[PDB]
Amino acid sequence: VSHEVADCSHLKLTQVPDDLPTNITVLNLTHNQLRRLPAANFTRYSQLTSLDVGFNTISKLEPELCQKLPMLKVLNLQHNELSQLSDKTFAFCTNLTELHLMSNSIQKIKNNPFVKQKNLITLDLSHNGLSSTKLGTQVQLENLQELLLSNNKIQALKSEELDIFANSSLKKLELSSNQIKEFSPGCFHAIGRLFGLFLNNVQLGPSLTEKLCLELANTSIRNLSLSNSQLSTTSNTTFLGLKWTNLTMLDLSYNNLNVVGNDSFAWLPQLEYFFLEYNNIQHLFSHSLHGLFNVRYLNLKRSFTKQLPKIDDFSFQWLKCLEHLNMEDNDIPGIKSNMFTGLINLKYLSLSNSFTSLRTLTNETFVSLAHSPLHILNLTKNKISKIESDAFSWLGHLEVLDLGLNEIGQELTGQEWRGLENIFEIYLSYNKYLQLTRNSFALVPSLQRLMLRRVALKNVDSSPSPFQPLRNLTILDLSNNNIANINDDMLEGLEKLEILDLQHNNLARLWKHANPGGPIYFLKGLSHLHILNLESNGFDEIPVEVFKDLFELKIIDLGLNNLNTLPASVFNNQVSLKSLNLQKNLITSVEKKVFGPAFRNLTELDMRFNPFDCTCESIAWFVNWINET
Ligand SMILES: *[C@@H]1O[C@H](CO)[C@@H](O[C@@H]2O[C@H](CO)[C@@H](O)[C@H](O)[C@H]2NC(C)=O)[C@H](O)[C@H]1NC(C)=O
Ligand SMILES: *[C@@H]1O[C@H](CO)[C@@H](O[C@@H]2O[C@H](CO)[C@@H](O)[C@H](O)[C@H]2NC(C)=O)[C@H](O)[C@H]1NC(C)=O
Ligand SMILES: *[C@@H]1O[C@H](CO)[C@@H](O[C@@H]2O[C@H](CO)[C@@H](O)[C@H](O)[C@H]2NC(C)=O)[C@H](O)[C@H]1NC(C)=O
Ligand SMILES: *[C@@H]1O[C@H](CO)[C@@H](O[C@@H]2O[C@H](CO)[C@@H](O)[C@H](O)[C@H]2NC(C)=O)[C@H](O)[C@H]1NC(C)=O
Ligand SMILES: *[C@@H]1O[C@H](CO)[C@@H](O)[C@H](O)[C@H]1NC(C)=O
Ligand SMILES: *[C@@H]1O[C@H](CO)[C@@H](O)[C@H](O)[C@H]1NC(C)=O
Ligand SMILES: *[C@H]1O[C@H](CO)[C@@H](O)[C@H](O)[C@H]1NC(C)=O
Ligand SMILES: *[C@H]1O[C@H](CO)[C@@H](O)[C@H](O)[C@H]1NC(C)=O
């Protein structure tokens, strides 16, 4: 209720609190039942820089309010009943920088209610019933940067209505959700400078959009947003007026856009950020994207027709500066031999769920990416079942390859990865089955992260381990594979390994003292291991020496096993341990000879759902149970 900011929100107040500190600089009276704001009630609060009375039932402002509050900068009156403004309403609010007047059923503005707002930066008149952008009769609001007029009833734009902004530089003119049917010649030129224009949810269509762009010719426009404006088609004339601009962001998302005519964007050589997501493009032509040679970011998520879309070879060849291409969630048949040809700056490519399928990654699938400096390639959710030898040989700069969430069922011969000289991470989690050999990862000794979660993983017990070549590995996820057989040298030579996930496997036997040959010390030498997940493996015994090398271990997860008895000294080398998790085991006792050194430095303990019996109290730090104790 007070940190020099007063929160009086949601309190069913019919009057301003008369007993807050004279300290306060922010008064928040949102969601109450105020009908009026009398000037006398604010004498006490001469220090307010912000007054938020949004969501009340205020129908008028006493002009003297603003002389009581000479420091008022932010005034929020949204969702009230302030439908009539006069020249008196804000005349004394000369210090305002933000004025929020949304949802007041303002239908008309009649004279100059904003003329004293010489320091105003933001004016928000959204969600009213305004049929015009006329907000005064003389040049004013010179400092205004954002004018928000969205969700009104504006039907035309006219120079004589916007010319009070002749001295203003508008970063944002938001006219979304108005039924604008006319851009009268010169309308945008009436504004001193116009940088950003939003006409989202304005039914325009190709013919009116072309007139609009003509009105934008020779303006300062950088950002133009036409989302859901029914731009069903574009042609080489639609954006012609933008030839006389330095437009850098165009948003044509959500347009049910079906046909992109050749040279539709020839007139946008400076465009850098292009949003085409959620459209219905049936066939992308080889010259549809001609001229876009400065585009750095292109979003094509769900841009193409569903169910099939056609992308001509060489369609992206023009996009010489494109660095980040999102093509996710589409029904493209497959990848043609020149699909990405010309993309000489592409560093990021998302093809997640982009194809009806890409059943087989052949040695030609990615050829058109050979001259791209590609670092990230996302191939998730493409129902991929088979990766052939040399599938990624074209991708010598690739750092991250995401192949998760496919249907890959194969032996990894190791040839799949040839050419991947710079690989840092391979994500293979959630595939149908992967059978490893000693050679599965030999061609990628630079690998640092390898995720093989839930891939029905076979033959990790290869004779030199499949992981032997990966001396720089820092993360290995082997979880959820029902692995029963691991050799003691599985992770030998992996001194850099920091994260090891082995949960939901079947390793219980390996750590029983009765295991034939004796227990398997597969954590030996892992001196930089920080996080170790051994949950849900059926463990009911831990050999005393299994964590003996784990001096840097910070987090151990041994929960959801069947442990009770732990041998004395088992956690003795655990000098760095911060979280010890043993929830949902069969633990009846907690003796110092085991837990003393483990508890020494913990910031977190979770032994929550165990069958306790012969116990020992808690002191210094986080134990999240009082019920599960
Ligand atoms: C697009 O950008 C160019 C280059 O930035 C603008 O050219 C400017 O015009 C002035 C005077 O005519 C010249 O001195 C310079 O070449 C540019 N000045 C600046 C701001 O750096 C051009 O005006 C821009 N187009 C539009 C419609 O504003
Ligand atoms: C002009 O468009 C650009 C690009 O979409 C906007 O800048 C981005 O803003 C978002 C968040 O609003 C960030 O995530 C990006 O990093 C920004 N881009 C860069 C590279 O600066 C920009 O806000 C738009 N201008 C206006 C005033 O609407
Ligand atoms: C590959 O693309 C998918 C999007 O299809 C990414 O998955 C999303 O990422 C976050 C964090 O992993 C999840 O919480 C989201 O729910 C995922 N979204 C979807 C739609 O599945 C994935 O992260 C990308 N891979 C890489 C390396 O960036
Ligand atoms: C494993 O990691 C080390 C990085 O610590 C790599 O060795 C370095 O390589 C870089 C770039 O080639 C050089 O700047 C250094 O001379 C190397 N550092 C040391 C300490 O030797 C090594 O290349 C990685 N292995 C692979 C196959 O990538
Ligand atoms: C656009 O379309 C047609 C080609 O069908 C052509 O006649 C016309 O000159 C092209 N370019 C422009 C800028 O009008
Ligand atoms: C791709 O693999 C097949 C082997 O089945 C071979 O015919 C072809 O020569 C290979 N292509 C390249 C680019 O090496
Ligand atoms: C606005 O300017 C005037 C100085 O003339 C003053 O009343 C007030 O302190 C300023 N706004 C602030 C700092 O809230
Ligand atoms: C542009 O697309 C048209 C389809 O409208 C196609 O016939 C033509 O080959 C393309 N232009 C050029 C010069 O390749």
DSSP 3-state assignment of 460?
Answer: coil
Is 444 within 8 Å of 468 (Cβ atoms)?
Answer: no
Residues in the chain after which the backbone breaks (C–N beyond 2.5 Å): 307
* CA atoms in the 13 A half-sphere facing the CB of 289: 31
Residues 6+ apart with CB under 8 A from 151: 126, 127, 128, 176, 177, 178
Cα(173)–Cα(186) distance, integer angstroms: 16
Burial-class residue 169 by CB neighbours within 10 Å (0-12, 13-18, 19+): middle
Cα(539)–Cα(562) distance, integer angstroms: 6
Report phi then psi at 434, rounded to 5.
-125, 120
Pocket test for ligand 1, best of 219, 221, 246 (most atoms within 8 A of CB): 246
Is 461 within 8 Å of 455 (Cβ atoms)?
Answer: no
- Name the closest-CA residue to atom 4, ligand 1: 246
Query: Does ligand 5 have an atom closer than 6 angstroms to the CB of 415?
Result: no
Q: For domain 1-629, give the fold.
A: 3.80.10
- Spell out which residues line ligand 1, taking CB within 6 angstroms: 218, 220, 244-246
Q: Which two tokens stand for residue 557?
A: 């997860």
DSSP 3-state assignment of 48?
Answer: coil
- What DSSP string describes 522-541? TTTT-TT--EEE--SS----
Q: Which two tokens stand for residue 64?
A: 């003297």
* Resolution value (Å, 1 decimal): 2.1
- What DSSP string describes 70-94? TT--EEE--SS------TTTTTT-T
- Name the closest-CA residue to atom 10, ligand 7: 71
Query: Does ligand 3 have an atom closer than 6 angstroms to the CB of 380?
Result: yes
- Name the closest-CA residue to atom 2, ligand 5: 236
Is 551 within 8 Å of 528 (Cβ atoms)?
Answer: no
DSSP structure class, residue 395 = -
Point out the ligand nearest to the CA of residue 389. 6
- Closest ligand 4 atom number to CA of residue 471: 1
Technique employed here was X-ray
Query: Does ligand 8 have an atom closer than 6 angstroms to the CB of 286?
Result: yes
Cα(35)–Cα(56) distance, integer angstroms: 7
Is 537 within 8 Å of 561 (Cβ atoms)?
Answer: yes
**Centroid of ligand 7 to alpha carbon of 278 (angstroms):** 47
- Name the closest-CA residue to atom 14, ligand 5: 237
Cα torsion through 460, 461, 465, 470, rounded to 10: 20
Cα(424)–Cα(446) distance, integer angstroms: 6
Cα(150)–Cα(136) distance, integer angstroms: 18
Pairing relationship of beta strands 122-124 and 233-234 according to DSSP bridges: unpaired
**Which residue type, as a one-letter code, is found at position 98?**
E
Cα(19)–Cα(41) distance, integer angstroms: 10
Query: Does ligand 4 have an atom closer than 6 angstroms to the CB of 422?
Result: no
For the chain, the straight-line distance linking the first and the last C-alpha, in angstroms and rounded, comes to 35
Q: Where do the DSSP E strands lie in 364-474?
A: 376-378, 386-387, 400-402, 409-411, 425-427, 433-435, 449-451
